[PDB]
Ligand binder design. Structure first.
Ligand SMILES: CCN(C(=O)c1cc(F)ccc1Oc1cncnc1N1CC2(CCN(C[C@H]3CC[C@H](NS(=O)(=O)CC)CC3)CC2)C1)C(C)C
Ligand SMILES: CCN(C(=O)c1cc(F)ccc1Oc1cncnc1N1CC2(CCN(C[C@H]3CC[C@H](NS(=O)(=O)CC)CC3)CC2)C1)C(C)C
Ligand SMILES: [Mg+2]
Ligand SMILES: [Mg+2]
Ligand SMILES: [Mg+2]
Ligand SMILES: [Mg+2]
Lengths: 442, 447
């Protein structure tokens, strides 16, 4: 650590942490290892080993300098750079593989790899435990501590790896999902997990944004750390103000969800931030991201804006339609399954009871765009998506709209399945049996 | 269908009115299972499913609502099942007749729903929603059978499944619902899976069937909130059944009542520890000590009160029961309960204890170390002869971590009976002053 950094200690409050982040983000190379260990330390004494009162666990220089030394010396100890000629200020694959192996070999052979609060370098140093994405982050933190300035975090919506080399052009798998390979076959197979190449390639500032989104305020299934929520919210505003969330759609979604919980006066309202996330995905990631729409959909859902919610879910299906469903895409499958088979059916039932969205042919058209996207998603997929469970809720959901509301609705149907049954969907009588068979055809 | 006697207990305006109805029905040779299910169903629905500085409330059940629902259930069954086609010699039901009632219930359900959802356990949910969970179906078949006058059809339950017994002396069994047929449960008993308790399952009379529907009350509103009123209702109904002697052969019901007494103790009542012990005594006396949950119930209570010795003793008891079973695919519930104990609760309890020890005690007690070894030995013996492994490398790490919470001086002299070849195979390593982590790991995970 430099004298500059040392003077920001001890961290006695949330404002002290925000000052340390502000100071580090001002530099060309923010110290990822310092910042990770500090969030790790604060998360550990607020979520994992707690103590009414709200409190901040004071981070003395003595504790954080020790942890920093432990991480940096461990990496430097394990990697002899004089064996890796590093011509043109670019790292070789052999060097990135080696740092990957150093991180891998330092982990416990057996732990709950899915547990909360094993995301930070704190958990790696004090516990020898990292989650999936904790590993990729640790490889990048190690690379920075070795002075390898071209090694960066790549993320999809559910996986992480590294890019390196002349233009961030090279990719390497470093962690497990659900090594040393490129991600090219993932991009080529058009799975959601690799976003068809439209994944985030972070600079050091997005890597700080990632570790801030990684803060997990969960204490148990019933209780969040208020202090960790407050810390995340202030750190995300700092990154917002400095321009570092511009190319981070999920971070704007995260900050919007926090603003819905506890609005910051003078700040953009949640709807603005959800739209900025969607604008970010459209502008920088070829509109290939699902969560910015799912975020907006959740907010409208929670506020009982049924039209707006169904519109946002139809958008999510309009994105997913250009993918193939592959084995490792199960997170987004479950999110679509929850929307189709639980949230929409319940929202429509709420509406039917108050009766409205059910007299609005616009809401019916959103529902059809939703199912059409899902059917087009399934086309060309190496595994089916729609089984008989889906079919029931389709018919149930269609039937919440009277013949007069459904009759004139005309949308573009990308999918062969919805094309195949356009006459059944606008018919005065819903032929439930035929719709069911058509949807589950395979 | 309903008698003047029953009609005069209406409307139900309070929890006490519901207790009066149950009291009146339990006084009879044939308590009306369909009436009682519809009433709990109705009350659950307006307290947990469709709710209203705050209010607690009781949803008034008018005769008009309950008599309608009763008629709907009983007429629907009588409509579907023509008894004159099933000659019923000796006052005993045929398999074809039980299978038919099973098919009627199955055919009445929505073709797709979340069969795993809360609040789809009652005949209320079946009549108003055409939705039943697994055990809701078995109960519905028995309620249908009673409304058809089939006096020999009774609810059978294990700790995670339900079917029916019928015939001369409850001789016959039929699968009626899904887990996770018209076939017997004989192959389940023979495979020695926990799901069929090796034949030591509950064969309910009509009073235990009321107890089952009372245990079926689900007070959950969402993940974070219980209906106070439904907890209060369940507790008073369980006391009624207790006082009348109907919980004597229902170990999980005494566990349920004990959990409620810990939440809100009833003055003048036996304390929770008494009720958990009654549950265990019931399992030992009437079920060949083949039940796991009476011990798990006791273990949870000790755990929540930070009686570490007593908790580890109760968990070691649970492993002493399971050791005489084979782990089969559909026993996943109890697997997960053992996994949670071994790999989460015990490690965390021991870590708590280690911290209170460095600060200025179960960890200096060789009795607690012995309990831990009995636990692992039962689990290894459970695995022996199983068609599925139980122990993988995840288990091994927490064993070593948990052994290591006890110093060499505490572990050294402990000698327990080892049923499993696996624990016998490494008895010297467990009491050694140095824990050979690597060897212990391989021994427990091998095969
Ligand atoms: C959240 C933790 N996390 C990851 O999960 C992650 C790891 C990776 F390797 C790659 C991507 C990752 O995701 C994120 C990355 N950066 C920031 N945020 C990430 N998140 C937030 C995320 C998506 C959104 N969901 C919340 C939504 C889900 C859909 C929901 N809509 S709905 O209710 O209509 C659907 C039922 C609204 C809330 C939480 C998890 C994943 C990172 C930060 C370590
Ligand atoms: C919802 C309850 N229910 C069933 O789940 C059920 C269905 C069947 F087909 C067959 C048996 C069934 O179980 C019960 C039947 N009758 C009454 N109670 C039943 N219960 C209570 C039961 C077991 C105990 N658990 C709670 C315990 C679990 C162990 C725990 N101990 S621990 O914390 O030390 C273990 C980590 C204490 C709380 C709740 C569910 C299953 C019936 C009443 C419909
Ligand atoms: Mg994920
Ligand atoms: Mg697209
Ligand atoms: Mg169960
Ligand atoms: Mg035994």
């Amino acid at each position: 650590l430099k004298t500059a950094q040392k003077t920001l200690f001890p961290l006695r409050s949330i404002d002290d942490v925000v000052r340390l982040f502000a100071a580090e983000l001002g530099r060309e190379e923010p110290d990822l290892v310092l910042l990770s260990l500090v969030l790790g330390f604060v998360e550990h004494f607020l979520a994992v080993n707690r103590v009414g009162l709200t409190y901040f666990p004071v981070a003395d220089l003595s504790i954080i300098a020790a942890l920093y030394a432990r991480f940096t010396a461990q990496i430097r100890g394990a990697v002899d750079l004089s064996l890796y000629p590093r011509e043109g200020g670019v790292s070789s694959r052999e060097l990135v593989k080696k740092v990957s192996d150093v991180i891998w070999n330092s982990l416990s052979r057996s732990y709950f790899k899915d547990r909360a609060h094993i995301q930070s370098l704190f958990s790696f140093i004090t516990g020898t435990k990292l989650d999936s994405s904790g590993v990729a982050f640790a490889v990048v933190g190690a690379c920075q501590a070795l002075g390898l300035r071209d090694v960066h975090l790549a993320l999809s919506e559910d996986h992480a790896w590294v890019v390196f080399g002349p233009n961030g052009e090279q990719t390497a798998e470093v962690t497990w999902h659900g090594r040393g390979q490129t991600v090219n076959a993932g991009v080529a197979e058009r799975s959601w997990l690799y976003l068809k190449g439209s994944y985030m390639r972070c600079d050091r500032k997005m890597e700080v944004a990632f570790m801030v989104c990684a803060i997990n305020p969960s204490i148990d299934l019933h209780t969040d750390s208020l202090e960790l929520l407050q810390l995340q919210q202030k750190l995300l505003w700092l990154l917002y103000d400095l321009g570092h969330l511009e190319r981070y759609p999920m971070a704007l979604g995260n900050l919007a969800d926090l603003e819905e919980l506890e609005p910051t006066p003078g700040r953009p309202d949640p709807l603005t931030l959800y739209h900025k996330g969607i604008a970010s995905a459209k502008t920088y990631y070829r509109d290939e991201h699902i969560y910015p729409y799912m975020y907006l959909a959740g907010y409208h859902c929670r506020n009982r804006n049924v039209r707006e919610a169904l519109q946002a879910w139809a958008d999510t299906a309009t994105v997913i339609q250009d993918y193939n469903y592959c084995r490792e895409d199960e997170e987004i499958y479950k999110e679509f399954f929850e929307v189709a088979n639980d949230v929409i059916p319940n929202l429509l039932k709420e509406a039917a009871s108050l009766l409205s969205a059910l007299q609005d042919p616009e809401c019916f058209a959103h529902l059809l765009r939703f199912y059409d996207g899902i059917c087009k998603w399934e086309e060309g997929s190496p595994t089916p998506v729609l089984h008989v469970g889906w079919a029931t809720f389709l018919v149930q959901s269609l039937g919440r709209f009277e013949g007069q509301v459904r009759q004139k609705v005309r949308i573009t149907f990308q999918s062969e399945k919805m094309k195949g049954m356009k006459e059944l969907l606008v018919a005065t009588k819903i032929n439930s049996s035929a719709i069911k068979l058509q949807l589950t055809a395979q």
